[PDB]
Amino acid sequence: SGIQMENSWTISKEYHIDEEVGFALPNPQENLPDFYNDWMFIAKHLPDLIESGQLRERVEKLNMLSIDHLTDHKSQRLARLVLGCITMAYVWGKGHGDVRKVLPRNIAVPYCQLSKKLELPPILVYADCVLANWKKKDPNKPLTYENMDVLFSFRDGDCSKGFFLVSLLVEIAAASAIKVIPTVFKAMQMQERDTLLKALLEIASCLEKALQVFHQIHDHVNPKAFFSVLRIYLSGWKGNPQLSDGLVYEGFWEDPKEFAGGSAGQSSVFQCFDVLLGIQQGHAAQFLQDMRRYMPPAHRNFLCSLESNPSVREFVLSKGDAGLREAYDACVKALVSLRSYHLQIVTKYILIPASQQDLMNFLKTVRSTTEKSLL
Ligand SMILES: C#Cc1ccc(NC(=O)CC[C@]23CN(S(=O)(=O)c4ccc(C(C)(C)C(=O)O)cc4)C[C@H]2C[C@H]2C[C@@H]3C2(C)C)cc1
């Protein structure tokens, strides 16, 4: 039947989409129960521990901590972020090729149990290091770069604050577009021309603003630092020649298991508005559907219910209504500009620095598909 609704105005809370921060976690927990203090210390001290060569031995001396004291969603998500960062640090070390193929059981077991409860793979994903990895400095001030911080970083100078928070702020900007989605579908059922037009224009304007928030990335991230340092800890063990069979989660699985590292495909924004605008469109469709299984399951169910709703695109073009066509086209254009900027960032922060020590084709093809969706 499509999107489930909490009331006449707001989508169901089962989708875990917040009115203010959207797909991001609202007011994330910063501290775990005292019981997990040893976990919190390691995660808070990851930069000096990796730098000093101490991280692995500190992890190796942790006791087994049960997850039963992680009683609510926010604490489980904080715990996943803490254990996820520790796992990446333990596996990659200093990033120079001295990798660990076995995650010690005292981390692997609670991490794998927690991940099973949340239906997330046992590797760091976007939902951890961006969507749950933030705080306000001043609770009474707004959600701005200057008034926020990340909870955890990997190395001093890795630009993880700039990379993660700017990404979060784009997610927060998109939240103003996401909350309009129910009005779009109500307007269509009611045949309310103006309500639909203004909904589409507000979506377009919020996506335009989200693109302006994205532009801040250059002011808080250094390309060399990103490519040579942060990217190490976002790397996974699926098709990776350094862990060709995967990672052994000691005490959970006998055999090694492959899980993919971070991908921009894990943000739900692009598919949210591709689906809404009917814009959605080989082996890349497999990788993209795979990245969907790295999103929180409720967000997956939102994306799926959205596809089950009537098509904005079909409604709009059948009206001989320039205003609706232009408003739809404004949304499409905003999405195209966001993809274009994504390609620029991939080129400046990944492709060039790599050249100095297939992807372009996939992304450029999806951008042109979007541009060909203009009516
Ligand atoms: C664990 C984990 C982990 C950590 C971070 C992320 N980040 C995202 O998913 C961000 C999504 C973004 C994309 N940009 S980005 O700067 O172009 C960007 C480019 C490349 C990548 C990586 C390295 C993961 C890759 O793909 O190789 C990540 C981001 C930032 C965001 C802003 C706009 C464009 C979307 C947006 C719509 C919200 C994923 C997994």
Looking up residue 181, the CATH number of its domain turns out to be: 1.20.58
What is the distance in A from the centroid of ligand 1 to the CA of 254? 32
Whether 371 maps to a domain, the answer reads no
Host domain of residue 176: 22-261+338-357
- When divided into structural domains, the chain yields a total of 1
In a domain, 209, yes or no: yes
Task: Tell me if 45 is assigned to a ligand binding site.
Answer: no
Report the structure determination method. Answer: X-ray
The torsion angle over the Cα atoms of residues 301, 303, 307 and 311, rounded to 10 degrees, is: 140
Residue 282 lies in a domain: no
Q: What does the DSSP assignment read for 127-165?
A: IIIIISS-EESSTTS-S-GGGEE-S--SSTTS-HHHHHH
139 falls within a domain: yes
d(C-alpha 312, C-alpha 278), whole Å: 7
**Angle subtended by helix axes 193-214 and 181-190, to nearest 10:** 160
Q: Which of 176, 267, 268, 338 for mutating ligand 1's site (highest number of atoms within 8 Å of CB)?
A: 267
- How far apart CA 158 and CA 175 sit, in angstroms, is 27
Contact 91, 231 (CB under 8 A): no
Is 9 within a domain? Answer: no
Strand spans (E) along the chain: 102-103, 135-136, 148-149, 248-249
- Residue 150 Cβ inside 6 Å of ligand 1? The answer reads no
Rg of the chain over Cα atoms, rounded to whole angstroms, equals: 21
What is the spatial distance between Cα 87 and Cα 349, in angstroms, rounded to a whole number? 24
24, 58 Cβ separation under 8 angstroms: no
100-133 b/e with 16+ CB inside 10 Å = b?
A: beebbbbbbbbbbbbbeebebbbbbbbbbbbbbb
Q: What CA–CA distance (Å, rounded) separates 374 from 331?
A: 9
DSSP secondary structure, 227-289, as one string: IIIIHHHT--BSS-GGGTT-BEETTT-SS-B-B----GGG-SHHHHHHHHTT----HHHHHHH
Measured in angstroms, the resolution is: 2.1
Cα separation, 2 vs 276, whole angstroms: 12
364 occurs within a structural domain: no
Residue 247 lies in a domain: yes
DSSP reduced 3-state for 126: helix
